[PDB]
Structures are given as C-alpha cells and as structure tokens.
Design an enzyme around this catalytic site. Structure first.
Site, PDB file in Angstrom:
ATOM      1  N   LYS A 247       0.849  -1.158   0.000  1.00 49.94           N
ATOM      2  CA  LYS A 247       0.000   0.000   0.000  1.00 49.94           C
ATOM      3  C   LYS A 247       0.899   1.226   0.000  1.00 49.94           C
ATOM      4  CE  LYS A 247      -3.840   0.126   2.576  1.00 49.94           C
ATOM      5  NZ  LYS A 247      -5.093  -0.164   1.812  1.00 49.94           N
TER       6      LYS A 247
ATOM      7  N   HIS B  24      -5.480 -13.459 -11.736  1.00 50.90           N
ATOM      8  CA  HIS B  24      -6.217 -12.366 -11.122  1.00 50.90           C
ATOM      9  C   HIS B  24      -7.496 -12.202 -11.936  1.00 50.90           C
ATOM     10  CE1 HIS B  24      -7.450  -8.515  -9.631  1.00 50.90           C
ATOM     11  NE2 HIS B  24      -6.558  -8.649  -8.654  1.00 50.90           N
TER      12      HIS B  24
HETATM   13 CA    CA Z   1      -6.229 -12.201  -6.498  1.00 51.25          CA
END
Ligand code: CA
Ligand code: CA
Lengths: 428, 428
Positions: free
Chosen positions: A154, A272
C-alpha cells in the site's frame, strides 16, 4: 418453429456430452421452449432454410435442450447437451465463442446466465490444468500444512523500483510468504518491470537468508503477448517461481499461452480475475463466477480468488472453493445450479481469500475455508502499530494459534505482535 | 473519508489526461461522492494508512473525480480524470485492468457502467489502430464506393472442407465480396482450419477468374496463441488478405498480437464481438458497446460490428458508426454519455451491419448508415428462390439501385433476380 427441432425433453445425454445449464429469461412474448431452441441452435450449428450442399455433420453436431426447470420468477433453468465434436481440443476461446458467445445478445432473450458447464473426460483432458497445483506450490515454498500468506503493498502504485524493493523486504522479513503486485501494475515508466523485479528479487534473497524460509513474488506479467513472453522469461531467469496474469483483461488465449511458458520454465500462475464483476454480478444475466473459476482451473491457474466469505453468498463462496480444489465435485442434493464434475488429470487450485482480513479474523476463515488457501492480509500487515515486520509476525502468530487449536485470547499473552493486533482490530 | 481526497469538483483536467465517464449507482447508504472517490482510488493508486517507504509517485499518479451529473434515477454520471503515467504504453490489458477492473465488484457500488473514455494524443498514439482501415480494405477488394457485402454459410457448422468449399463458390460467383466464417468456427476435427482454407481459396480463385472481381475470406483464426500464429501465416501464405478474430473470447492481448502479425503479413482484421452482450446490455452496469468499439479501433480491427439499426437504440447505433469511422468525433450538444475524441493517426474502421437484411431493406440501411459499411446479407442470399448465385445477384442489384438513386420497384423490372427478392421478402 424451426427451433422446436432443438428441444427434446425425452433426451438423456450420456456422460460423454458437454452439458450447459442456463438461467433463461425469455423476452416478452417468447415461450421458454422457443428461447431454449434458439439458444441451442445459436450455440451450435445454426439453422438452414434450403441446402445447396449437404452438411454431413449438421444433425451430428446439433445441440439439444432436454430439460427445463421453472424458477417461478420469470426465468427457467435450461439444460442443453452438446456433442463434443463441436469444440476444438484444448481451446478456451473456441469454447467461449459457442457457449459464451452470441447467445447473450439474442432478441428473444431478456436475460441469459450461464450457470455451469459439465465437461466430459475426453474433452476435459485436452486442457493441461494447473502446472503445480496446491501441492506443487506448497513444495515450492516448503510450507507443508498451514495457509500461505500474501500481501499487496500500500499504496498499490507510486513506488520507484528502489522504493518498492524496500517495501517488499519488510513484508517478507516478518513472515509473509508472497509479495504480490496489484492487478494494474504492469510496466509503466515510473517503475518498469525489469527494474522492479531486480529490486524485489534482491529483497527476497535477503529475507530467505535471514529467515531460513523460502519466499516468492507474484509478478504481474499482464501485457501484450510479446511483452508478456519477455517478462515471463525474466521472472524465470531471476529464479522466481511465480507469475501473475489478469486473465480476463489479457484474455483466455493469453492465459493459455502463459500456461505453456509456465510448463517450459517450471512456474506457477496466479490468476487475477479483474473485470469479472462486469458480468458475474447479475444473477439473471452473465456468467457465474463458479464457471469462470472452473475455466481458470482448466486453463491452468494455480491460484484463483473465490470471493469473500451463514447466508447465500457464503454458501456460494464455499461452492467456488469446492469446484477449484476437489478431485470430484458433486452438487448437494437438490442444487440445480451446478453440475457434477470429475477432475481426472487436473490438479487442484489454491483458493485465495481476501477482504480486510486482520489477525483476529484469520482462525474463522481457516475453519470455514480450510487450511488449503492463500490469505491476502494486506491491511492487517501494513497497518500494524509496530510496523509491517511486526504486522507479518502477528498474522503468522494468529495462523499459528489456529493450527495449534489455541484460543486467540490465550495465544495473545505470550505473543506481543499479535497482542496489539487484537487490541487494534479485534475480531472484525 | 480517506476517499474525499480523490474528489475535487473545482478541478479542470487539461487535454492531456485520460478522462473516464462512469454511470454510478451507489450501494445503499453510500453517498455519490463517497462512491466516486472509491472508484477513483481503486482505479489508480489505491490508498495508504501509514507509509513505511515514501511513494514518490503517489500524488502524481492519483485519479480525481471532478464532475457529477445526477440522472434522477438513483445513478449519476461521474467524470474521473487520470494521469497518463498510470498506463503502460500500447497495452489494452493494462488499461482494462485499471478502468475496467476491480471497480466493478466493489461493495460500495450497486452498479457501475463505463460509458466512454477520452484518450489524449500522447497515449492514443501508442496504439497502432487499423492496419488497412476503410480505404485499405477497399483497395484490397478494388471496390471504390459501394458498400461491401459478406455472407456466412448456412448452417454455420456441419460442412466438411470439400462441402464448405462448394458452398463458398456459389456465394462469391454471384456477387458477394467476402465469405465469412461464423464466430465458433475454429479448427474442429470435422473441418480443420488448413483443409478448410485450401478448399475456400480454390473457390475464391475460380470466382475471381470468372467474375473479374477480387474476393476475400474472413477466416476465423480464433485459437490459443501458438495455433493462431500458425493459422495467420497459413492465411497469408495462401494469398488471402483477411483474418477474423473473436477478440473478446480470445482476448485483447490476442487481438493486439494478431495486429502485429497483420503488420508483418499485410493483412486486414475482422473483429468479431462475441461475448460482448454479457456485459454491454445493462444500461446500469458493464461497459458500453461504444467504448468496446473504440478500444477495438485502437487495438487495430479493420472491421467491427456496431449492432442493428428513429429511436434510442438506433441513435446509439449511429453513434457507434461515428466513433469507429470519424477522424474527429464530437458528441451532439447536451449528450453527456460520450466524450469528444480526435483520432489523429488512427485509421477509420468499417462498421458491419447485419440482422436479417434482404434486398428490399438494403437501400434504407445504406441511406441511414452510409456507403462505408460492410453488410452481412446471409439470409437474403442463401434463401433466394433461384439459388444463392441469383441471391447474391439480387443483393448486388439492390445495392446498385441505391448507388444509382433508383427506386427499387423501378429497378426491379429489368432485373430478374432482384424482382423475386422483392416478391419473396418485400420491404421488411
Ligand atoms: Ca487475487
Ligand atoms: Ca461480425
């Protein structure tokens, strides 16, 4: 009425036909039988009016709607059986162009959801499935039993290669197993793929040497084909064992190509699913995430996100984990939205759990989803009051309590890092 | 509240930022400003709580929601401005992973439709656009002014290579310019790609020698990457000038790879949009077909289907044709759903019209959609009472009447084939 020829409620498909189950909302004025024959015709051999040359394979290749279930809301479940000769061997694109193709835009249809597809062994075995699977990834990492842990930095973008490499170090050094690129990291100018990969692979080497624990990097190789090919080889040449691909935004052919390079280079693939929610959210139109996960396992991801986990959506997250991990999936009695599916010769996939997971919540996710998962534990790690190293240790201690069957309150008394995790975030 | 940092209704993006316009339905209890900042953050640099290493590019890369329009129905138009440094040059997958990615599944959103995206010149020129465009395809076929005609065989599957080749002959011999595979034709065992291509290319050579008119084949190369590469080279080696690709089921990376091979081999690309209606139908969630067409033109199709053509859907079909053909697209006054878009260095695309077109209907489609179109005229051709040769002649005579400004009734008196087309199907 030419479309009655594709409906036959007395038909019984064998175990050797592809079976699709659709949730069909006919347009105004269209009967379900009419809609169903149009779906069967459009997703197979089409129609003809007059024949100027005989098609010797028309009646052979033709799909049949053979079964109807009225959901009482204006929509029906329709089962359609498909001869396997309709499909090109090993090709997800050709499969999708038939069963996920023009049928969605037909005027006779107000909504069409593809709920599940049964693949028979002779067709299912033309696909490679995962290169590594659960067991091969565990062996890569040397992690025998516990869930594996992953963290995305992050913020997800904004780091130079140098900066990204120090961030990864702190993550791995405290106990996280995998550092993960976010889905939109590729090779932008501020942080090119090669310079970023060098900085992370140096961070991994330090963390493995200090901890004694293997670590890996889920490097995002999402890219036009020639750029992806180079990036997969650079990952391999640097001794990393993982690549990540956004398989819906790069596309199914890109995923199957990445699976061939993974074979060549002995890699695992993190798939993903970015973009899936443009079409997997509407229960009346689109594709179920269940089927997207099944196709991802066929095409050859080793890991895939199953969505967030008692109610209807939790039930379905549990069906997602079952369809990607089991060797023989069987729907529960009376569940008409899924089909039975043996997975002979297709390795199981790691489900990925994510969604604001903090140390306090981890034992319950592990009890409900099982130990064979990857947990993404970003916020819990980078937000720890004592820094990310301590944050990764808190998550690992939380996992340790779950493996050892110890209450978190009890464990969090001889374990400092975890203690403050329970202080700060509690049992969310 | 960390998400207020991504909203700024006093901001004015320059002409050099990417601009997205979203139609946003916030979930229950979420304000539009909250939903909009979450969209801007998730589709750019994410968030951070504490910083353990400075991201020198975070504030630079951050997206801003700068403008809101309440549609009065629970949804808003939101404009979001994006720094171009967020995007990898020339990569549709990376673009989609940002602006078409996780934002669709966020819990704060009950619906998210991506309506349009403005691409600035410096980013737009990293994409090749069409290899040939309208003018290059016209030059391939030697067709200066009239619409080009295409036909898919009926039935769409079931022919052996030998049988498919005779069907194509009759189509071309009577006046059709392009024979087109259907979207789910690939290389199934009953009709492998190479054996099918040989039989069609022999049919083309006969038809060109007898008619004096160039003809082409839209051969479906949809396939895993290595199989597509071989099929594109076989098409090129046989002297055919066209390939077709299902760019949503093979995927964007496959399309961009096909565009590079088209460069190498001097081919045009027909982009088939099968699967688009899983996510372009719902006005409240998904991606507009307008934007899918704009991305297809950037990635490099030479032809693309714009959907079927006064009412709202016809208006939008007209906007689709404008965005793929024009050099400088400008929305009409007060239209907030589309953005202005110059297309410097990107050739125009042929819109494809289809949908039960018969000779009687063709003049009206040409008057409304313009002469620079490809019409798919399957039913009108293969269903003609005198056989497909006469059927292709009827369509050509119908097009001839439109080019010459002659009423169809008047033309259909010294033109037999057309005469019966108007008899049989009339003005549908
Ligand atoms: Ca993922
Ligand atoms: Ca088309």
């Amino acid at each position: 009425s030419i479309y009655l020829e594709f409906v036959d409620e007395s038909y019984k498909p064998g175990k050797d036909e592809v079976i699709a189950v659709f949730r069909v909302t006919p347009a105004q004025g269209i009967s379900i039988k009419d809609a169903a024959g149009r779906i069967a015709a459009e997703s197979s051999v089409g129609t003809w009016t007059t024949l100027s040359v005989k098609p010797s394979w028309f009646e052979k290749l033709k799909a049949k709607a053979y079964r109807f279930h009225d959901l009482g809301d204006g929509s029906w479940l329709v089962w359609v059986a498909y001869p396997v000769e309709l499909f090109e061997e090993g090709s997800i694109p050709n499969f999708a162009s038939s069963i996920l193709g023009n049928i969605f835009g037909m005027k006779a249809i107000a909504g069409l959801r593809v709920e599940d597809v049964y693949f028979p062994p002779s067709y299912l075995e033309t696909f490679p499935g995962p290169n590594k699977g659960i067991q091969g990834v565990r062996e890569i990492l040397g992690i025998k039993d516990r869930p594996i842990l992953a963290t995305v930095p992050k913020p997800k973008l904004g780091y130079t290669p140098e900066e990204y490499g120090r961030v990864a170090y702190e993550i791995l050094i405290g106990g996280i197993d995998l550092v993960k690129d976010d889905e939109n990291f590729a090779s932008q100018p501020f942080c090119r793929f090669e310079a970023r990969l060098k900085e992370v692979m140096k961070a991994i080497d330090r963390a493995e040497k200090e901890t004694g624990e293997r670590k890996g990097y889920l490097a995002n190789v999402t890219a036009p084909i020639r750029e992806m090919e180079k990036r997969i080889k650079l990952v391999a040449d640097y001794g990393n064992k993982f690549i990540m691909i956004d398989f819906l935004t790069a596309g199914w052919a890109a995923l199957q190509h990445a699976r061939e390079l993974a074979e060549e280079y002995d890699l695992a693939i993190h798939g993903h699913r970015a973009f899936h929610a443009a079409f997997t959210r509407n229960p009346k139109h689109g594709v179920s995430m269940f089927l997207v996960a099944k196709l991802a396992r066929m095409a050859g991801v080793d890991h895939v996100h199953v969505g967030t986990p008692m109610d209807a959506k939790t039930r379905e997250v549990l069906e997602h984990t079952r369809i990607v991990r089991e060797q023989y999936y069987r729907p529960k009695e009376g569940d008409l939205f899924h089909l039975e599916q043996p997975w002979s010769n297709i390795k199981p996939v790691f489900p990925v759990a994510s969604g604001g997971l903090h140390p306090g919540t981890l034992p319950e996710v592990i009890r409900v989803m099982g130990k064979d998962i990857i947990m993404q534990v970003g916020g819990g790690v980078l937000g720890h009051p004592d820094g990310p190293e301590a944050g990764a240790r808190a998550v690992r201690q939380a996992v340790e309590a779950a493996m050892k069957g110890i209450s978190l309150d009890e464990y969090a008394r001889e374990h400092r890092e975890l203690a403050r995790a329970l202080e700060k975030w509690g049992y969310v």
